[PDB]
Amino acid sequence: GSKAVTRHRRVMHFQRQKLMAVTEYIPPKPAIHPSCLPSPPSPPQEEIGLIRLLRREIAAVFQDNRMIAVCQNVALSAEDKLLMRHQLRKHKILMKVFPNQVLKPFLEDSKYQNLLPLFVGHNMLLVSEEPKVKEMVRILRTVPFLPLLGGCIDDTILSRQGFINYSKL
Amino acid sequence: AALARLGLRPVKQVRVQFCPFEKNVESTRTFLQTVSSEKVRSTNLNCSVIADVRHDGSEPCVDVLFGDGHRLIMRGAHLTALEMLTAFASHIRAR
């Protein structure tokens, strides 16, 4: 003789249980699964203002600075990297880092199309307004582990040996 | 940081030659970055990492000379950075 409200789930009458089973939620089923059908693309959000500013900075740097070189930024210690950056700043070689995703359209739509393969992986730019290739080369040589990935001097693409010989010129 | 934990103590020298203008040097450059990481170099100060950037056009190569006098050659034309690192670690453990 249990009451209407019990601490345990009371056993239902068999007819009531059959009624509950029959009146069960049947979810709608599409004829074809949506994942097995083409999905129209969704328009992405507008370009970020930071991305636009990065594009403007990249364009300004490439338009103004004459000595442009790409170097694979090896995982040096922060103190030594800052010291090398200060040494470059002594000879006005301002090291710049920009995202490859932002940089790629500029290179593709600019005169620097052939420089695209040089920007795979962690890379920085040793750019100076005036050609100081000898100082840049000796600073690169100070750290043998840190390489020089060629570059482009005065709208003229050169390899590492070309950069070496430009200072001798 | 398996490479850093293992260290470069039995490794006399590591040299990586790659042409940046080529497109198959991606794995080689990733391996160079991993080896030139500050921890890996600081594990063994005797070992030196050399970078050879050339416009010759040859396939990228990695030559590791160990303290035992043996050498390990890994050509990055059709090898991945993870595979090269695994081979490097295996040879370091062997030597």
């Binding site: 052939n114 060629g150 693409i157 050169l158 390899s159 040996q161 070309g162 | 416009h55 010759d56």
Partner: peptide, 11 residues
């Protein structure tokens, strides 16, 4: 428009 590629050191 696009700058010419760097000549090979061998050449």
């Amino acid at each position: 428009e696009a700058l010419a590629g760097a000549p090979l050191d061998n050449a």
